[PDB]
């Protein structure tokens, strides 16, 4: 079977008033071969701001994380940045 990695992405908003539900919907709308979206939660990071923390499992040879982060970040109306919170081999 293909080599995989489970990744937890932090997707940060622009402010405490960013529609997080639309933000996560736009991320999960992203479709790539070998990409499986997992669980997610909205985690407070202080001062009322909440970040989207979402899991995804990717096939190493098919899904570029650099590209995935860059595609998520195209949703400028909701996303300010993304960061890899953690990642493990599967």
């Amino acid at each position: 079977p293909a080599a995989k990695s489970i990744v937890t992405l932090d997707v940060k908003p622009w402010d405490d008033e960013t529609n997080l539900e639309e933000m996560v919907a736009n991320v999960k709308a992203i479709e790539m071969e070998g990409l499986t979206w997992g669980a997610h939660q909205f985690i407070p990071i202080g001062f009322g701001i909440k970040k989207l923390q979402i899991n995804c499992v990717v096939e190493d040879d098919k899904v570029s994380l650099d590209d995935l982060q860059q595609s998520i970040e195209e949703d400028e109306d909701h996303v300010q940045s993304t960061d890899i919170a953690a990642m493990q081999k599967l």
Partner: protein, 438 residues
């Protein structure tokens, strides 16, 4: 009460390092436990109730692949002395950068070696991903290493086989740079649990592992004891404050709120801080993390803090926040660093200007001058002003950032002194900053 250490587990795809790392988290931690509980119960179907932990681990894996487990990828487990944040090194090529600029640098690396004849040889390949991980670890200063020879059940717990594997693996790690005498070699079975948490009964000849430390010789039998015997590293609590910014928010009724990870020192409300390379200075009104308001954010904490009379424009991601009254951070005109060239389709000549990732900064820097070529392990200078760098070379290079940039010498501020060089859709080199012209 436990101290915190980070561990990275590396090895060849057939080494069985995921089952091994999974066994420790399973029996010494609490990750995706509701999924574990589900499968321990299901296991009753196999016979009359008995179940191998490896069976449960296998089902947990498939469950995760479905994307329906709940816990994030941040994994931890406990030993008698430590709370260990562990990373089962992904094979993913983008993990290389993450290993370099990602948070939580390893305090110790665990190299898992498959004992089978074919498998072993495939893993110590000079071009193997395993050698690269070992090299990156060594280059980034991970000096503690532990070796576990797995699948000892597939070679019948044969002593000679284990001995030969220790010999060749030693040669393998010595070439990377590790002194084999300071490395414990533990024969194990991630699947059957031998020498994992409890000593094995399948190898009478096994007297245990051992390692030379500065205070003396340390011995044990299990992998868990080897991990518990990892030496306490010193944390930069007393070094001046350094907090690279990840994001900057403008919150109504509050003002400017940058958010980032405290890499060195401590941030507290009342301190007067400076943001480099801009040079803006101001007082820290308050500090928050998760739901709590803090009296202090220490190394490792990802905090958000409010500051007045600074505009969300004025400061951005990649800027570094430090103490204005204790070696405040500064931009630089250039910086010199030891660069190790990883395997890649190409050659580096002065003038090369790729993107460098250093802490939260993402800036293209010019290889302004190739100062020296060095013996990687010793650091001895082999030639002045080499004319080009190729794969495998270690060299001192003068860098000139294209945008205002704040970096530090690896010796003073580690998290701001190591960087990844990006090109050809990969990390082509790893650097360690040696001097900075502030």
């Amino acid at each position: 009460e436990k101290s915190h250490i980070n561990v990275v587990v590396i090895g060849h795809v057939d080494s069985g390092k995921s089952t091994t790392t999974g066994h420790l988290i399973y029996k010494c931690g609490g990750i995706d436990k509701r999924t574990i509980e589900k499968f321990e119960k299901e296991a009753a179907e196999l016979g009359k109730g008995s179940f191998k932990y490896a069976w449960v681990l296998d089902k947990l894996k498939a469950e995760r692949e479905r994307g329906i487990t709940i816990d994030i990828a941040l994994w931890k487990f406990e030993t008698p002395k430590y709370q260990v944040t562990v990373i089962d090194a992904p094979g993913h090529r983008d993990f290389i950068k993450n290993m370099i600029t990602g948070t939580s640098q390893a305090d110790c690396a665990i190299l898992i070696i498959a004992g089978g004849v074919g498998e072993f040889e495939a893993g110590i390949s000079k071009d193997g991903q395993t050698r690269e991980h070992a090299l990156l670890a060594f280059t980034l200063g991970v000096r503690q290493l532990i070796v576990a020879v797995n699948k000892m059940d597939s070679v019948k717990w044969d002593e000679s086989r284990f001995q030969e594997i220790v010999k060749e693996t030693s040669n393998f790690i010595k070439k990377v740079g590790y002194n084999p005498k300071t490395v414990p070699f533990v024969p194990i079975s991630g699947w059957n649990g031998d020498n994992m948490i409890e000593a094995t009964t399948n190898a009478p000849w096994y007297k245990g592992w051992e390692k030379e430390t500065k205070a003396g010789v340390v011995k044990g039998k299990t992998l868990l004891e080897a991990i518990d015997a990892i030496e306490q590293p010193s944390r930069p609590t007393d070094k001046p404050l350094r907090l690279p910014l990840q994001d900057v928010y403008k919150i109504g009724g509050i003002g400017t709120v940058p958010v980032g990870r405290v890499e060195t020192g401590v941030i507290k409300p009342g301190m007067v801080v400076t943001f480099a390379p801009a040079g803006v200075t101001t007082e820290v009104k308050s500090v928050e993390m998760h739901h709590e308001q803090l009296e202090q954010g220490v190394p490792g904490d990802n905090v958000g803090f409010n500051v007045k009379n600074v505009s969300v424009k004025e400061i951005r991601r990649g800027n570094v926040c430090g103490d204005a009254k204790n070696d405040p951070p500064k931009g630089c005109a250039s910086f010199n660093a030891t660069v190790i060239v990883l395997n890649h389709p190409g050659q580096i000549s002065a003038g090369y200007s790729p993107v460098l990732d250093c802490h939260t900064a993402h800036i293209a820097c010019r290889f302004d001058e190739l100062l020296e070529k060095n013996d990687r392990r010793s650091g001895k200078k082999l030639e002045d002003h080499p004319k080009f760098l190729k794969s495998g070379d270690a060299a001192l290079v003068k860098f000139v950032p294209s945008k205002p940039m704040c970096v530090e010498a690896f010796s003073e501020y580690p998290p701001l002194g190591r960087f990844a060089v990006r090109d050809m859709r990969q990390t082509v080199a790893v650097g360690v900053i040696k001097s900075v012209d502030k």
